[PDB]
Amino acid sequence: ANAVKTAEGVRAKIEELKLNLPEGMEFSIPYDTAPFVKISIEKVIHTLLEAMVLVFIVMYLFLHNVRYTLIPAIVAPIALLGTFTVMLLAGFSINVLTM
Amino acid sequence: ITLVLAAVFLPMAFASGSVGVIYKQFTLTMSVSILFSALLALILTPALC
Amino acid sequence: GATAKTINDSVVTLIERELSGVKNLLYYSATTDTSGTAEITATFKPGTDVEMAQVDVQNKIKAVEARLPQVVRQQGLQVEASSSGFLMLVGINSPNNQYSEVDLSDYLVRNVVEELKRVEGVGKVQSFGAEKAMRIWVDPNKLVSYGL
Amino acid sequence: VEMAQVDVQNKIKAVEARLPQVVRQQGLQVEASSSGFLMLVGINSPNNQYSEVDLSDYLVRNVVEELKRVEGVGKVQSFGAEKAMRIWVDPNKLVSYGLSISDVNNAIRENNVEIAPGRLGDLPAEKGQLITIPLSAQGQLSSLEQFKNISLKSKTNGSVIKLSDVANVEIGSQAYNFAILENGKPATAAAIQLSPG
Amino acid sequence: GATAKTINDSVVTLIERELSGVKNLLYYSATTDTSGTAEITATFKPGTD
Amino acid sequence: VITGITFAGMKYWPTAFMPEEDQGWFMTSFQLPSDATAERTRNVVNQFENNLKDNPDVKSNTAILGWGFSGAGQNVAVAFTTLKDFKERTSSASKMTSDVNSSMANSTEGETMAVLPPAIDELGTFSGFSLRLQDRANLGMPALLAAQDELMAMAAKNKKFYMVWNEGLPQGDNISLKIDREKLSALGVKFSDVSDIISTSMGSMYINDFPNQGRMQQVIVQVEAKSRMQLKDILNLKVMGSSGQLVSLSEVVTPQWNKAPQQYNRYNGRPSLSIAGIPNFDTSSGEAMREMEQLIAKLPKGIGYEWTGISLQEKQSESQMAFLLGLSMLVVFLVLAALYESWAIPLSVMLVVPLGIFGAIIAIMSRGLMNDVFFKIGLITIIGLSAKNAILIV
Amino acid sequence: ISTSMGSMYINDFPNQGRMQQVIVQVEAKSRMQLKDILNLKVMGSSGQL
Amino acid sequence: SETQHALGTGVFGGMISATILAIFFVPVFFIFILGAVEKLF
């Protein structure tokens, strides 16, 4: 099962039950491990974007022109989109290792 | 080069234990990425140039 | 009705012997204490169907049911999928102390635990409290004095 | 086979409570077909020193467990009798003291019992408790002499007697229906199957 | 030979407590009437075995 | 020469399995001695909370008293300490674990171990090596515990480990009443009476359900807490007799105190004891486990060991590195031979892999990173990329 | 009739760490002929076998 | 960042060394291997 889905469902249901709580009783979530997963995924995505930017700068300083560099640049996103399609077809998930 | 790089990653996908699952992600992702990039290199880049 | 040693001798050892047949079994361990219960955890090969393993342990553990102590048979054995870690801790607390631990636990079990189990993907909800019940604290001296 | 067996288990559970009490006590044994057979390992007593029950006990306690430690060995199954305690009562002696077999059953059922262990200092506990200690008692009997010393009361005259007086107590077979002989002498055998794949 | 309330309190609720935590469940209903019989139905997600 | 240096570095450099990362929370386990009530464990947990109140780096601190990942009882507690966000927090959670251990070692009654979350979501409960010390020659539980004491003594004087301990309930004392059946029958008291008065003295007994506020709840009858706190209370439980004169238990039961294990653990069908350890910094998880094996080698005959959890997977990973790294190169050689219709041209392309390893191995050495799975993946990637570069010219 | 001629399972006892059945039956010498069976004595309310 | 460092340092060093040493060794490997093969047969 996916941790993020379970955590969001638990929190949504708790929010729903806050209406029926008797006065003087309060809910709390002292310990949740869900956020770190999102933080790690976002950090990996940011690192990927920085890698694309650096690769583009490298191809620019060697090819000397934006027109030349745009040709190889657009290959990368399309290949990754195809990989996303293949991951959906096979059953793999978006995890830190895949990214 | 495409075939070499794609073939390099396959063997470690069939490993045993947790490391097998760990290596499967990298093998699938990188091999499919390289194959799609090679397909685009012989298809899109010629027309773009 | 048994001490840790007795449970180990007549329950844990008997049950653990049937694990050899189970397919895709990596290792198996067992733990018992002076609590009247024993837990046998079997680990399987990475990347395997948990439900199939559960049913194939349930089938194998019946070989010793006849040989298992007669007292153990009635209570039965529970085979279930096990996770080693927690995901969320949902708590109820009273800032004003209006409700005590007993009342908070009773409310949590009555109105929340079942609802949380309904959440998508939830595997288990372990409540560290208890429900309310009628406790009769008997004094042996009075009973023996009255002949009861 | 696993799912067929599970379905059988699930369906037979409905009518378990309506079965005879003795049948429920001994239990219903559900098992799929072998589907695997590697070899048979047998123990025999050429000297005739030991009986079938002793051979089966020595196979179960000292041999069966080790034989499953070999790679590829699974479901080692014995074909021998299981030891048990047996009380052979004498009706003539039973009526000599005016007793009945039901009295013997009641006496053995009452004197031989399991005492529930507990903990001194268990929760809830009186404030100021410093130590909690487990405590247990032995109610069951483990030796023949204890079972022979079970006390009964003569109904005719009231003189206390013992289960030894009205019965012979010995460790024998749980059932005597089947016997196994190797070349005409006591023996036991166990089938060793093959683990899947 | 009992009221609907007795069966609901002593039979339906107890089973429903455990029946909530079953995989692939979509919903579950329970019905008790004045015949001594109670029926608890559990509808699972499509495609479940 | 370069190939020889690479081979030596690959063989003799320390190895690990997975780098550890700060996930923003840690776990503290408290294990008071066996003769401990809830009050003492509560006092220890309260001291831990009080110490953690001064830290400006702790967001939430929940404590579960009575439950532990290794056992359950009145001397076991587990506390979850959540840590604030890294941007607003400068503590390096490992430093908090170390500081908690140091603070709780000096003035606490029982063991208090603060540990980091495991690298993998469901492999183990701590961040360290887990081992099972097994009695493989029917040496007996006391012999296994003596071996366990010896091993702890040897591990406490080694620099390759930070803290090695045993995860489980401790050995403890017990009372074993012996009912004198001879005097029991002489006084005319029925055995069932004693078996039922002792059994119900300290044990909860459920009877029936009752409706409260529309819910069926249990009805439990138990002896009052005052009469089940001391041995004299139970031993003064009078029982009826044939003559009609009450007889106390003390007349018929002889108390006996004996020391024995409170928890029984078995691993792979053998009696076993579970041991956890945290490797010391400048030592990898493989280096620590190697010396753990060496230390266990000198233990008494008949005692074996077996790694479990994330140690067994680490060994599994280390074992198949050679086969994977050889078969990958063989696959590249075969593919190149198939493509270029030669057996010598692929050989030239396949002689650059050692150069690729030369530079990666030394980079990880310079940065101080161990030989983990990520390093192996990088090695495979370099095998591919060096072949690409060689092919471009060849 | 069930206990004298049929095996009666009453409880279990510990033999060297293994729980084993305890059974009661009549001796062999007293259950080989029909005459002995017809002489089996049953307790009565009046107190006479 | 620990996982990123572990995944990156080794491959960084390996690629640098591979490129720098290969650009000068692969011609040497080719000449030596091809000459030896031709001479042998």
PDB file of N, CA, C and O in Angstrom, chain F residues 147-168:
ATOM      1  N   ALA F 147      27.198 -17.526  27.720  1.00  0.00           N
ATOM      2  CA  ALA F 147      27.850 -17.141  26.473  1.00  0.00           C
ATOM      3  C   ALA F 147      27.507 -15.704  26.102  1.00  0.00           C
ATOM      4  O   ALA F 147      28.364 -14.950  25.632  1.00  0.00           O
ATOM      5  N   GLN F 148      26.258 -15.354  26.333  1.00  0.00           N
ATOM      6  CA  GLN F 148      25.780 -13.999  26.007  1.00  0.00           C
ATOM      7  C   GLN F 148      26.477 -13.014  26.920  1.00  0.00           C
ATOM      8  O   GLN F 148      26.758 -12.040  26.407  1.00  0.00           O
ATOM      9  N   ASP F 149      26.713 -13.255  28.196  1.00  0.00           N
ATOM     10  CA  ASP F 149      27.437 -12.370  29.102  1.00  0.00           C
ATOM     11  C   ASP F 149      28.894 -12.244  28.678  1.00  0.00           C
ATOM     12  O   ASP F 149      29.456 -11.140  28.638  1.00  0.00           O
ATOM     13  N   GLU F 150      29.522 -13.374  28.340  1.00  0.00           N
ATOM     14  CA  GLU F 150      30.898 -13.331  27.859  1.00  0.00           C
ATOM     15  C   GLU F 150      31.011 -12.471  26.609  1.00  0.00           C
ATOM     16  O   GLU F 150      31.897 -11.616  26.517  1.00  0.00           O
ATOM     17  N   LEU F 151      30.113 -12.675  25.644  1.00  0.00           N
ATOM     18  CA  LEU F 151      30.177 -11.939  24.387  1.00  0.00           C
ATOM     19  C   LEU F 151      30.014 -10.445  24.622  1.00  0.00           C
ATOM     20  O   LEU F 151      30.702  -9.631  24.000  1.00  0.00           O
ATOM     21  N   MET F 152      29.098 -10.067  25.515  1.00  0.00           N
ATOM     22  CA  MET F 152      28.939  -8.656  25.844  1.00  0.00           C
ATOM     23  C   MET F 152      30.203  -8.095  26.480  1.00  0.00           C
ATOM     24  O   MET F 152      30.604  -6.966  26.170  1.00  0.00           O
ATOM     25  N   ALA F 153      30.848  -8.866  27.359  1.00  0.00           N
ATOM     26  CA  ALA F 153      32.089  -8.398  27.966  1.00  0.00           C
ATOM     27  C   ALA F 153      33.166  -8.172  26.911  1.00  0.00           C
ATOM     28  O   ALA F 153      33.875  -7.158  26.940  1.00  0.00           O
ATOM     29  N   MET F 154      33.306  -9.107  25.969  1.00  0.00           N
ATOM     30  CA  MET F 154      34.314  -8.943  24.920  1.00  0.00           C
ATOM     31  C   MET F 154      33.973  -7.778  24.000  1.00  0.00           C
ATOM     32  O   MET F 154      34.869  -7.067  23.531  1.00  0.00           O
ATOM     33  N   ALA F 155      32.687  -7.574  23.713  1.00  0.00           N
ATOM     34  CA  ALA F 155      32.292  -6.486  22.830  1.00  0.00           C
ATOM     35  C   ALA F 155      32.443  -5.122  23.489  1.00  0.00           C
ATOM     36  O   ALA F 155      32.659  -4.130  22.785  1.00  0.00           O
ATOM     37  N   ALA F 156      32.335  -5.048  24.814  1.00  0.00           N
ATOM     38  CA  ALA F 156      32.438  -3.777  25.518  1.00  0.00           C
ATOM     39  C   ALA F 156      33.843  -3.188  25.502  1.00  0.00           C
ATOM     40  O   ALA F 156      33.993  -1.990  25.767  1.00  0.00           O
ATOM     41  N   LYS F 157      34.868  -3.984  25.199  1.00  0.00           N
ATOM     42  CA  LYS F 157      36.246  -3.510  25.184  1.00  0.00           C
ATOM     43  C   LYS F 157      36.797  -3.350  23.773  1.00  0.00           C
ATOM     44  O   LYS F 157      38.018  -3.278  23.602  1.00  0.00           O
ATOM     45  N   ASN F 158      35.932  -3.295  22.764  1.00  0.00           N
ATOM     46  CA  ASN F 158      36.351  -3.166  21.375  1.00  0.00           C
ATOM     47  C   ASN F 158      36.020  -1.770  20.864  1.00  0.00           C
ATOM     48  O   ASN F 158      34.986  -1.199  21.227  1.00  0.00           O
ATOM     49  N   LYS F 159      36.899  -1.229  20.021  1.00  0.00           N
ATOM     50  CA  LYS F 159      36.698   0.097  19.450  1.00  0.00           C
ATOM     51  C   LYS F 159      35.856   0.079  18.181  1.00  0.00           C
ATOM     52  O   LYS F 159      35.460   1.151  17.709  1.00  0.00           O
ATOM     53  N   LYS F 160      35.571  -1.097  17.620  1.00  0.00           N
ATOM     54  CA  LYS F 160      34.816  -1.174  16.374  1.00  0.00           C
ATOM     55  C   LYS F 160      33.310  -1.086  16.584  1.00  0.00           C
ATOM     56  O   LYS F 160      32.574  -1.002  15.596  1.00  0.00           O
ATOM     57  N   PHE F 161      32.837  -1.102  17.827  1.00  0.00           N
ATOM     58  CA  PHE F 161      31.416  -1.012  18.122  1.00  0.00           C
ATOM     59  C   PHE F 161      31.159   0.167  19.048  1.00  0.00           C
ATOM     60  O   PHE F 161      31.981   0.498  19.905  1.00  0.00           O
ATOM     61  N   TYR F 162      30.015   0.809  18.866  1.00  0.00           N
ATOM     62  CA  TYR F 162      29.630   1.960  19.712  1.00  0.00           C
ATOM     63  C   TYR F 162      28.874   1.416  20.912  1.00  0.00           C
ATOM     64  O   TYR F 162      29.358   1.712  22.022  1.00  0.00           O
ATOM     65  N   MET F 163      27.788   0.681  20.724  1.00  0.00           N
ATOM     66  CA  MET F 163      27.010   0.083  21.831  1.00  0.00           C
ATOM     67  C   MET F 163      26.375  -1.212  21.350  1.00  0.00           C
ATOM     68  O   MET F 163      25.570  -1.059  20.496  1.00  0.00           O
ATOM     69  N   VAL F 164      26.683  -2.385  21.878  1.00  0.00           N
ATOM     70  CA  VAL F 164      26.110  -3.690  21.567  1.00  0.00           C
ATOM     71  C   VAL F 164      25.362  -4.171  22.801  1.00  0.00           C
ATOM     72  O   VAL F 164      25.917  -4.171  23.906  1.00  0.00           O
ATOM     73  N   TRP F 165      24.110  -4.582  22.614  1.00  0.00           N
ATOM     74  CA  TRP F 165      23.268  -4.987  23.730  1.00  0.00           C
ATOM     75  C   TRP F 165      22.341  -6.105  23.277  1.00  0.00           C
ATOM     76  O   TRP F 165      22.368  -6.536  22.122  1.00  0.00           O
ATOM     77  N   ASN F 166      21.520  -6.579  24.211  1.00  0.00           N
ATOM     78  CA  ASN F 166      20.562  -7.648  23.957  1.00  0.00           C
ATOM     79  C   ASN F 166      19.154  -7.066  23.972  1.00  0.00           C
ATOM     80  O   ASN F 166      18.783  -6.354  24.912  1.00  0.00           O
ATOM     81  N   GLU F 167      18.376  -7.369  22.935  1.00  0.00           N
ATOM     82  CA  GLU F 167      17.004  -6.881  22.807  1.00  0.00           C
ATOM     83  C   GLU F 167      16.067  -7.992  23.272  1.00  0.00           C
ATOM     84  O   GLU F 167      15.881  -8.994  22.578  1.00  0.00           O
ATOM     85  N   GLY F 168      15.480  -7.811  24.444  1.00  0.00           N
ATOM     86  CA  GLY F 168      14.568  -8.795  24.991  1.00  0.00           C
ATOM     87  C   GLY F 168      14.426  -8.633  26.485  1.00  0.00           C
ATOM     88  O   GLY F 168      15.172  -7.901  27.134  1.00  0.00           O
TER      89      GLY F 168
END
